[PDB]
Chains A and B, each alone.
Chain A
Amino acid sequence: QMQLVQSGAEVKEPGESLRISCKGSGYSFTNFWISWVRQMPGKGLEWMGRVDPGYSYSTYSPSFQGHVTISADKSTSTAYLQWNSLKASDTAMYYCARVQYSGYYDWFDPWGQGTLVTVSSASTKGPSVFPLAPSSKSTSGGTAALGCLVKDYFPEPVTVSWNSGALTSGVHTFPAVLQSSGLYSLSSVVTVPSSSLGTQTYICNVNHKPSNTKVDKRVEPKS
């Protein structure tokens, strides 16, 4: 069971430096190169570069020569992909994979699980929670939809429970969206019966550990 374990996911500001890591195990680390593959969001795979940890020789595709440095540490069986100045466009998934030759065998026999890197001007900022009411008057749907609106928050992700976890059925938290402002915004609806609008009350519990914000918000209709 040879394996490649990569450093945890990252969010960074442009101009900061960043060195992600790829640790191997279950094989003789010095006999194989480690390379390094980029996958822009929505796009396919690009080879970035490689390091032969046996001799420390390390090469790069022309696209990446000078944008990154790829070294290794024989002793700790660790390979590194390192920036000095991150671009906003460096935001992508970065895979490492173990290959033995440039020939002719060739082939990336084991891959790491992937390290996600995010780069944005935006500063760590918590959301604003807004309520979304249902059409209470209705005509035997017999359901009616309500929800919450999380807006202008950075970075990802947020957790949205309901009634502090009492409501599982009906709940559907939607994937967020990336604005041109740089900030995220998502919504969480919950389709409930119309008759239960009389008694029951609904608060959405929005948590954003990065910004360290906790917000409840009740939801109701109006004149």
Chain B
Amino acid sequence: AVVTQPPSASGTPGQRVTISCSGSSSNIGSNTVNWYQQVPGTAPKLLIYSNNQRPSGVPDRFSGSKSGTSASLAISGLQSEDEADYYCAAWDDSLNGWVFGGGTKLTVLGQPKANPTVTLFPPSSEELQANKATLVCLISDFYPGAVTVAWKADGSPVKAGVETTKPSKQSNNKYAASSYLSLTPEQWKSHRSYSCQVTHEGSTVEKTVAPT
């Protein structure tokens, strides 16, 4: 869009963070701005309206302003419940329509940086008999989240059909992904013993399986 929001914002409980929202003369310039909050897994909520007002159910630690082509949301005294996607939105005269900013993901930095607990399963005897096979790297239990995965056969970057999930949160408030690799017996047998190394915050955490 022709209105721009920084994707990331951060603060510890009780801090203040502004969230810039930067547009142009045709949207944020001549028209009013409104802010919406989206706790993930929910529809968004009206947070600030008329540039700077608060709906009844919004506490006064949230506050918004608007000067020229830029509008800023101020969260003054963060709480756990405030980490969500934040969107400004103004009517654009060139488009005769509203434009949202790309959003700003806000994080609160309380929880401690826990490590992942991987489990690696090989293909089962049944799957082999179907002229098929699948290795399974299951991860679970870790903050902050978003990690990368890597598979090594003998000991080289393999990528023969690697599918991986998004993190997505657990019920215990930590994150958990899974990674699946595909290949027929011919790759599963001929190679020595597949490893799956799960890096999370510069942390090598790999588990390995043989064809035995």
Contacts and interface: CB of A to CB of B under 8 A. Distances in A.
Contact of B166 (A42, A59, A102): A42
B124 A103 contact: no
Interface stretch (A66-74, A78-86, A130-138): A130-138
Contacts of A222: 125
B95 A61 contact: yes
Contacts of B164: 177
Contacts of B163: 177-180
Interface residues of B, number: 45
Contact of B119 (A145, A151, A179): A145
Measured as residues with beta carbon below 8 angstroms from the partner, the interface class of chain A is 35 or more
Contacts of A62: 95, 97
B140 interface: yes
A172 B38 CA distance: 27
B165 A149 contact: no
B136 A187 contact: yes
Contact of B121 (A42, A114, A132): A132
Contacts of B165: 174-177
Given A45-B36, A61-B97, A112 B91 contact: no
B189 to A, nearest CB: 16
A185 interface: yes
A47 B136 contact: no
Contacts of A113: 43
B45 interface: yes
A189 interface: yes
Contacts of A45: 36, 38, 44, 87, 89, 100, 103
A185 B87 CA distance: 34
Interface of B: 31-32, 34, 36, 38, 43-46, 49-50, 55, 85, 87, 89, 91, 95-103, 119, 121, 124-127, 134, 136, 138, 140, 163-166, 168, 170, 176-178, 180
**Pairs of residues from A and B, 7 with the lowest C-beta to C-beta distance, nearest first:** A44-B103, A107-B34, A107-B49, A132-B121, A47-B98, A61-B97, A45-B100
Interface of A: 35, 37, 42, 44-47, 49, 59-62, 95, 102-114, 130-133, 145, 147, 149, 151, 172, 174-180, 185-187, 189, 222
